[PDB]
Every structure is written in structure tokens, then in C-alpha cells.
């Protein structure tokens, strides 16, 4: 379908798995969380930022291991606008509109697909504007880029768990190409940079 094509095509460039998040949670004390983002990893961020707008589906695979019965883990997805837990036993863990995956160790890793879910017609990589005009802290925040949040807990009634989240964009469409970033990244929430030289230096302008 898509793979038997040039590696220069947009889908082959972007539809590659990456580990985007590494965390831990314990069975005593208590849960892990990650807000889905595309600015989390510099290599991924750089490739996506070569475009201004993008539309894609998300594939999420979870590699879960643990250290000191069958151990069951719950992975919960909260869509934009859904309730979130604050506690290991918050009511939000049982919400019917917050999909969960129940999985046990020894089976193949958990996997879910999240479709394009923005209200707008594309996710914006850049936003020359404000969520609120008079609030300077909102410059660059596009509220249409909320991809939802993941939560993880151990299901039971001195165990330590570790989670690796693998992310892969699929069926990716992009618009309006941009120059690749020259500067190193400073923060995930900004486009701030340290002014940087256009290239490496030479000792003379001539061929030798």
C-alpha cells in the first residue's frame, strides 16, 4: 500500500515508531500519566515541524515491565475534554467515555489506535496567535491541538512498574512546508531559540 514506495514520500518519512515517553508507577504510596504530544522528542519534532499543518491517526504500543498471582495493568485514555484522575481511586477511572485497556503480563504488548480527533481540519505545528489576546502566556497555544491524555495504574485490591510508550503517526497528510530548524530546541512549549550560525565555518572563500 504505502511502504512499497520511495522513502522520500511523506508517509515513509513520518510513519515510523518512536519511543516518546518513559515512566514509572508503584502499587503502593501511585499512577503514571502522559499528555499526548508531538514536541516530546527532538527527532520527531523536527520532522513534523517541516510542515505547518498535519492530519494523522495515532498508533500507540505499550511496553510494560515490572519488578518486586498474574499482574494486571490498566491503561486509560481520556479524550480532550474528558475528566482526569487526581488520585489512584478517582471516579474518572470508571468513566465509560474514557476508554481503558486491561492487560496482563506475559501477553503481547497492549495496542490502541486513536483517530484524528481535532475540531479543526488539521493539527497546527505553528500558531502565530493567542488563545486569549490579552494574555501573553497564551502566545503560540492552539487549543485545537489537544490529542488527549494517557493514564496508567496497576490493577489490584513492593511492586514497581516501568512503561515505554511507542508512538507512530499513520495515514499522514501534510501542508505548507517550512525550513528545517537551525537552532537547538529549548522548550516543548515554545519556539524560542538561541541565535545560531547558518552553517559551519571555512578558512577561506576559495576552492582549496
Amino acid at each position: 500500500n504505502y511502504h512499497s514506495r520511495s522513502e522520500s514520500t511523506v508517509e515513509n518519512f513520518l510513519c515510523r515508531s518512536a519511543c516518546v515517553y518513559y515512566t514509572t508507577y508503584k502499587n503502593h504510596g501511585n499512577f503514571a500519566q502522559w499528555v499526548i504530544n508531538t514536541r516530546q522528542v527532538a527527532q520527531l519534532r523536527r520532522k513534523l515541524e517541516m510542515f505547518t499543518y498535519a492530519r494523522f491517526d495515532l498508533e500507540l504500543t505499550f511496553v510494560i515491565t515490572s519488578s518486586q498471582p498474574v499482574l494486571t495493568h490498566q491503561i486509560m485514555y481520556v479524550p480532550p475534554g474528558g475528566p482526569v484522575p487526581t488520585k489512584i481511586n478517582s471516579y474518572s477511572w470508571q468513566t465509560s467515555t474514557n476508554p481503558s485497556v486491561f492487560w496482563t503480563e506475559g501477553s503481547a504488548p497492549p495496542r490502541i489506535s486513536i483517530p484524528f480527533i481535532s475540531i479543526g481540519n488539521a493539527y497546527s505545528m505553528f500558531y502565530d496567535g493567542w488563545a486569549r489576546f490579552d494574555k501573553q502566556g497564551t502566545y503560540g497555544i492552539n487549543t485545537l491541538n489537544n490529542m488527549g491524555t494517557l493514564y496508567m495504574r496497576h490493577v489490584n485490591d513492593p511492586i514497581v512498574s516501568t512503561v515505554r510508550i511507542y508512538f507512530k503517526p499513520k495515514h499522514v497528510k501534510t501542508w505548507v512546508p517550512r525550513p528545517p530548524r537551525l537552532c537547538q530546541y529549548q522548550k516543548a512549549g515554545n519556539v524560542n531559540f538561541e541565535p545560531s550560525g547558518v552553517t559551519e565555518g571555512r578558512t577561506e572563500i576559495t576552492a582549496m
Partner: protein
């Protein structure tokens, strides 16, 4: 020869042979409450190009926000949409040399001089008054990191050619025309909290002239909105 163009109650002239760049190969069209009373040319105050000028920029929905009826339609509506034709011209003699890049950049989100902060509204845009790029790293708490080499975006300035643009080389041409389509993630938006694109004019070859010549070159920017739409 010379082509006279009239829109509304305003007239400008261009060279009949001048080239027109149409961004992304797309002409503006309608999708709403149309308004053609604002489809006139708005000429912005000219800027002077000197030997040492680092460059200029304008945010568009904001650049025209005080311009009579256009400014009023932004003020009386919740949502809106528009495309623009931008005419950029230089007044120079055959004894002047230099070269400008005239480029329109969608979503030109800019970085702050202070890494921990975000730039403020005036450092990003001074409305119809051009903002100026710096040759040096800028400094301030809300200041834009306007150093020219990174175009305020953290990219190399030589790669801005990816965006709709035209070069002005004074030995061959003194003008550029860019047709800029509406580009966004949504069909219509709030025109006060979002700048669809930024117009940047950056010298790549410094202005220079013969010894008895005028020491500066005026650069004039004329803007003509198209297919404006607003909520009912």
C-alpha cells in the same frame, strides 16, 4: 508599457510586464457575509532602505486593522476570512545596487529574546508600522529575537525561499507582486488573535550607490484584500 489598476476609489500603477507570484498555485475564492466595500488598495507608509538596513516585517490581519473600513469589519464581526494581493515597489536609479527578498510566511510564530518568556503583542507587531529585524542578537524580557540570520523563527534565513516569494534585484527589477491565498487549519477565524501570515522584506545584498546618488531607497507596500468574508 504601464498598467493602471483601479479598485474602489483608489488607483495604482505597475509595469505592464511585471511578474506575479501566486502562492501555492492558489487564487483566493469565497467559501458567509461578503463585503467588497473594502476591496481597495491600502498603501502603507514607505520605509527607507539604507546601506545598513537589516530588514522589515508586517503581520497582515494586524497591519490593516486601523485601515478605515477594513479595520471596522474586523471590529464588527466574530469570525472572518480574506486573501491578499501584495505589491512591493522600490524607487531607485540605475546608479543604485542591492537585492531584497520579499517573502510571505504563514504562521510565522516568533521566538522571544529571553528564552524563559514569550514575546509581547507590540514587539511582534506594530500594526501598520513596520517592525525591524536586527543585525545583532536582541535583548529584553518581551522582545522578539529579531536577529536577521534566524528570521525571528530559529531557521536559516537563506531557506525562506520555501515560502511564496520574489527577489528584487535592482539591476533587473524594482518590484514584486505576491498573491497570498487564505491558509489555515479552519475555514474562518478570529482576526484579532491570529495572524495568518507575515510579510518580510530582507536585504541579501546591501544597498549601495554612486557617490552623488540619493543615500536611501524608498520601499512601498500596497495591500489589496480579496474575497473578504465575515459571519452574518
Amino acid at each position: 508599457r504601464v498598467r493602471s489598476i483601479t479598485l474602489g476609489n483608489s488607483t495604482i500603477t505597475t509595469q505592464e510586464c511585471a511578474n506575479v507570484v501566486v502562492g501555492y498555485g492558489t487564487w483566493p475564492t469565497y467559501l458567509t457575509q461578503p463585503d467588497v466595500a473594502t476591496c481597495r488598495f491600502y498603501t502603507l507608509e514607505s520605509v527607507m532602505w539604507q546601506q545598513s538596513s537589516p530588514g522589515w516585517w508586517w503581520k497582515f490581519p494586524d497591519a490593516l486593522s486601523n485601515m478605515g473600513l477594513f479595520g471596522q469589519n474586523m471590529q464588527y464581526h466574530y469570525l472572518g476570512r480574506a486573501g491578499y494581493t501584495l505589491h512591493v515597489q522600490c524607487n531607485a536609479s540605475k546608479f543604485h545596487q542591492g537585492c531584497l527578498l520579499v517573502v510571505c510566511v504563514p504562521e510565522a510564530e516568533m521566538g522571544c529574546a529571553t528564552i524563559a518568556n514569550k514575546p509581547d503583542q507590540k514587539s511582534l507587531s506594530n500594526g501598520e508600522t513596520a517592525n525591524v529585524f536586527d543585525s545583532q542578537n536582541t535583548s529584553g524580557q518581551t522582545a522578539v529575537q529579531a536577529n536577521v540570520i534566524n528570521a525571528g523563527m530559529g531557521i536559516g534565513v537563506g531557506n525562506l525561499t520555501i515560502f511564496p516569494h520574489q527577489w528584487i534585484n535592482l539591476r533587473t527589477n524594482n518590484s514584486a507582486t505576491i498573491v497570498m491565498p487564505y491558509v489555515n487549519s479552519v475555514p474562518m477565524d478570529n482576526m484579532f488573535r491570529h495572524n495568518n501570515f507575515t510579510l518580510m522584506i530582507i536585504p541579501f545584498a546591501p544597498l549601495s550607490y554612486s557617490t552623488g546618488a540619493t543615500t536611501y531607497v524608498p520601499i512601498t507596500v500596497t495591500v489589496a484584500p480579496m474575497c473578504a468574508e465575515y459571519n452574518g
